[PDB]
Design an enzyme around this catalytic site. Structure first.
Site, PDB file in Angstrom:
ATOM      1  N   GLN B  19       0.785  -1.229   0.000  1.00 27.88           N
ATOM      2  CA  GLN B  19       0.000   0.000   0.000  1.00 27.88           C
ATOM      3  C   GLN B  19       0.821   1.286   0.000  1.00 27.88           C
ATOM      4  O   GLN B  19       0.311   2.345  -0.359  1.00 27.88           O
ATOM      5  CB  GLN B  19      -0.943   0.014   1.203  1.00 27.88           C
ATOM      6  N   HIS B 162      -5.483  -0.809  11.784  1.00 28.97           N
ATOM      7  CA  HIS B 162      -5.029  -1.370  10.518  1.00 28.97           C
ATOM      8  C   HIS B 162      -5.926  -2.498  10.012  1.00 28.97           C
ATOM      9  O   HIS B 162      -6.154  -3.487  10.708  1.00 28.97           O
ATOM     10  CB  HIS B 162      -3.592  -1.875  10.692  1.00 28.97           C
TER      11      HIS B 162
HETATM   12  C1  LIG Z   1      -4.973   1.701   7.754  1.00 27.63           C
HETATM   13  C2  LIG Z   1      -3.585   1.731   7.124  1.00 27.63           C
HETATM   14  O1  LIG Z   1      -3.451   2.246   6.002  1.00 27.63           O
HETATM   15  O2  LIG Z   1      -2.636   1.230   7.752  1.00 27.63           O
HETATM   16  C3  LIG Z   1      -5.624   3.105   7.552  1.00 27.63           C
HETATM   17  O3  LIG Z   1      -4.980   4.047   8.413  1.00 27.63           O
HETATM   18  C4  LIG Z   1      -7.108   3.109   7.898  1.00 27.63           C
HETATM   19  O4  LIG Z   1      -7.970   3.170   7.014  1.00 27.63           O
HETATM   20  N1  LIG Z   1      -7.400   3.048   9.194  1.00 27.63           N
HETATM   21  C5  LIG Z   1      -8.774   3.046   9.697  1.00 27.63           C
HETATM   22  C6  LIG Z   1      -8.868   2.110  10.903  1.00 27.63           C
HETATM   23  C7  LIG Z   1      -9.195   0.626  10.798  1.00 27.63           C
HETATM   24  C8  LIG Z   1     -10.213   0.311   9.675  1.00 27.63           C
HETATM   25  C9  LIG Z   1      -9.751   0.180  12.141  1.00 27.63           C
HETATM   26  C10 LIG Z   1      -9.223   4.442  10.116  1.00 27.63           C
HETATM   27  O5  LIG Z   1      -8.432   5.216  10.659  1.00 27.63           O
HETATM   28  N2  LIG Z   1     -10.498   4.755   9.855  1.00 27.63           N
HETATM   29  C11 LIG Z   1     -11.135   6.038  10.168  1.00 27.63           C
HETATM   30  C12 LIG Z   1     -11.189   7.000   8.983  1.00 27.63           C
HETATM   31  C13 LIG Z   1     -11.733   8.361   9.412  1.00 27.63           C
HETATM   32  C14 LIG Z   1     -13.272   8.352   9.510  1.00 27.63           C
HETATM   33  N3  LIG Z   1     -13.926   9.181   8.485  1.00 27.63           N
HETATM   34  C15 LIG Z   1     -14.405   8.735   7.313  1.00 27.63           C
HETATM   35  N4  LIG Z   1     -14.506   9.574   6.290  1.00 27.63           N
HETATM   36  N5  LIG Z   1     -14.787   7.463   7.162  1.00 27.63           N
END
Ligand SMILES: *[C@@H](C(=O)O)[C@H](O)C(=O)N[C@@H](CC(C)C)C(=O)NCCCCNC(N)=[NH2+]
Ligand SMILES: *[C@@H](C(=O)O)[C@H](O)C(=O)N[C@@H](CC(C)C)C(=O)NCCCCNC(N)=[NH2+]
Ligand SMILES: [Ca+2]
Lengths: 215, 215
Positions: B19, B162
């Site tokens: 990624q 993650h």
């Molecule tokens: C994961 C990575 O690339 O290592 C990436 O940071 C990610 O998408 N993390 C997620 C968490 C997991 C799915 C638990 C995250 O941080 N999600 C929240 C996004 C912010 C919320 N707002 C919107 N627009 N959905």
């Protein structure tokens, strides 16, 4: 868009509620936006049920938190949301007990405001009505707000932790603001409301997670 | 459900991707689950496009993070997702350039696994195929994993950060585990994979945010 608009003056906003210890801010914010659209499309102002959302929006985590977009998607897929009287708020998670007989509103989707754009948020509030938003409400200064236009340089626009409702915007003694409806009871802030700095570099992240339901 | 299943042995899993610095773990996790269902329903294994998701899932925040459920809802509403070849991954946000001509898969919805239930996750993996999951991957021990069944009592099941892909589950030398496909390249872990402790009190929050697309 007008220089100011206050939907409370148009009867689009229901009384201020108290969410209690349950982390259901997202549910009250979503219900607030739906109540506004319901009034605009039907002419009637009714309390919708945040408990219906807390118990049934499986994409969210009940009192553990959630998102407004997820709530709107649920109402659309479920073909409705109950009124508060048909599904009372108790501030705790329970099994989903949605009853279509008590349906008081529907949703055909949702739209999000471009991230960080307060001009777009202003236009959305003017053209649509109350809009669901999220902010950083962790500061002591925020919790003890009582009057005036709130601004604390310590607010972190990247630390959104509390969903509320933008029911309007305007200016008070030269200070542009957003009229925000909270869910911490009528005794918090100014009768449950807080005026938050507008056009001050997206203070508290007011325009970072805004959305409204389509009806 | 069998005592063990490894979908890589059934050809439901594509090569491990990288990624990059972009916070698109959610996009790779979602694509992985969709690729598994695509193979199961069509017999063909194809790389789907995480970039399509990064650029077009407006409910998420591109390289700023997002959710898998949101991704599945997008594919359903959009009536499709492009193949990797039709929408290459570049590791940065761009305008949405989805082209239906390159559509390689569809989604009819999604289902979530009961929060914290590893038994349900096991049954879902056995009956459906690869499942999207989220974990706490912040520990140094996790990042330097190379072999064996991973377990670090410091992992916080309440600090999910993650998204990855559960492509199976089994047991290695008496240690039950989850076969996890990461998106940090083929050189990380064991050829891009990590075996994570299963039935050890929901270690790292493996069963707290699991879901799979319906096809
Ligand atoms: C994961 C990575 O690339 O290592 C990436 O940071 C990610 O998408 N993390 C997620 C968490 C997991 C799915 C638990 C995250 O941080 N999600 C929240 C996004 C912010 C919320 N707002 C919107 N627009 N959905
Ligand atoms: C807000 C409150 O009650 O004061 C409440 O904690 C809440 O819902 N917070 C949200 C944050 C704002 C909407 C920015 C929150 O923490 N959301 C994340 C929920 C966990 C993600 N998982 C699921 N199932 N959606
Ligand atoms: Ca969603």
């Amino acid at each position: 868009a007008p220089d100011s608009v206050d939907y409370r003056k148009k009867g689009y906003v229901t009384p201020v509620k108290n969410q209690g210890q349950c982390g259901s801010c997202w549910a009250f914010s979503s219900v607030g936006a739906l109540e506004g659209q319901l009034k605009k499309k039907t002419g009637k102002l009714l309390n919708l049920s945040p408990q219906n959302l807390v118990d049934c929006v499986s994409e969210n985590d009940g009192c553990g938190g959630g998102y407004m977009t997820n709530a709107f998607q649920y109402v659309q897929k479920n073909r409705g949301i109950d009124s508060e009287d048909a599904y009372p708020y108790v501030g705790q998670e329970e099994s989903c007990m949605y009853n279509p007989t008590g349906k008081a509103a529907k949703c055909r989707g949702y739209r999000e405001i471009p991230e960080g754009n307060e001009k777009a948020l202003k236009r959305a509030v003017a053209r649509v009505g109350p809009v669901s938003v999220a902010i950083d409400a962790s500061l002591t200064s925020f919790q003890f707000y009582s009057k005036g236009v709130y601004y604390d340089e310590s607010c972190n626009s990247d630390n959104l932790n509390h969903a509320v409702l933008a029911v309007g915007y305007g200016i008070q003694k030269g200070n542009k603001h957003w009229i925000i409806k909270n869910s911490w009871g009528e005794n918090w802030g100014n009768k449950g409301y807080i005026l938050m700095a507008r056009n001050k570099n997206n203070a508290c992240g007011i325009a970072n997670l805004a959305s409204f339901p389509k009806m």
